[PDB]
């Protein structure tokens, strides 16, 4: 009911996620609720990178977050955190 | 109702199928349920080959699985295998 195409900066979302979840654990595939600019979103932890692939880990201040739009969603995301724009050449590869 | 257009790779799901079903009994035409990333799939055994076609065989660590999306199934798979044929003449004896 709150879907919109308004822009959202992915790096800002990552910074807020780290700030609110600093020193808080996360496991691959975890489904949670995330607050960005008083806007609610559903987040699925797709991958965890060791700083080795581990199913679970602990969030720290320097951890990066890469936000990819869920397929079939109109959410508009911008920034270099995960993806902002992509092009698909017309010629067959 | 859980059907979705999100791509699925047969390699990952086949590796997990083996991990969760390796060193177990499998019969031709056997039906079971398989979990992959908290997603349930119905699997039907079509044809079995022994490392010789066997009615019942024991999946193992080195077991190989070729997965085919069911007929009239929107599942996206990066692999499948099914082959059989024959031929006749075009001159009455």
Curated annotation (Swiss-Prot), chains A, B:
The modification N6-acetyllysine is found at residue 1. Belongs to the AAA ATPase family. The chain holds residues 105 to 211 of 744 of the full protein. This is Vesicle-fusing ATPase. The modification Phosphoserine is found at residue 89. Homohexamer. Interacts with GABARAP and GABARAPL2. Interacts with GRIA2. Interacts with PLK2, leading to disrupt the interaction with GRIA2. Interacts with MUSK; may regulate MUSK endocytosis and activity. Interacts with CDK16. It is found in: Cytoplasm. Required for vesicle-mediated transport. Catalyzes the fusion of transport vesicles within the Golgi cisternae. Is also required for transport from the endoplasmic reticulum to the Golgi stack. Seems to function as a fusion protein required for the delivery of cargo proteins to all compartments of the Golgi stack independent of vesicle origin. Interaction with AMPAR subunit GRIA2 leads to influence GRIA2 membrane cycling.
């Amino acid at each position: 009911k709150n879907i919109d195409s308004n822009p959202y900066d992915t790096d800002k979302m990552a910074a807020e996620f780290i700030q609110q979840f600093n020193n808080q654990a996360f496991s691959v595939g975890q489904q949670l609720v995330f607050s960005f600019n008083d806007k609610l979103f559903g987040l699925l932890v797709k991958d965890i990178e060791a700083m080795q692939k581990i199913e679970v880990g602990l969030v720290v201040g320097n951890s990066q977050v890469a936000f990819e739009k869920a397929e079939n969603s109109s959410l508009n995301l911008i920034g270099k955190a995960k993806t902002k724009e992509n092009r698909q050449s017309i010629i067959n590869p």
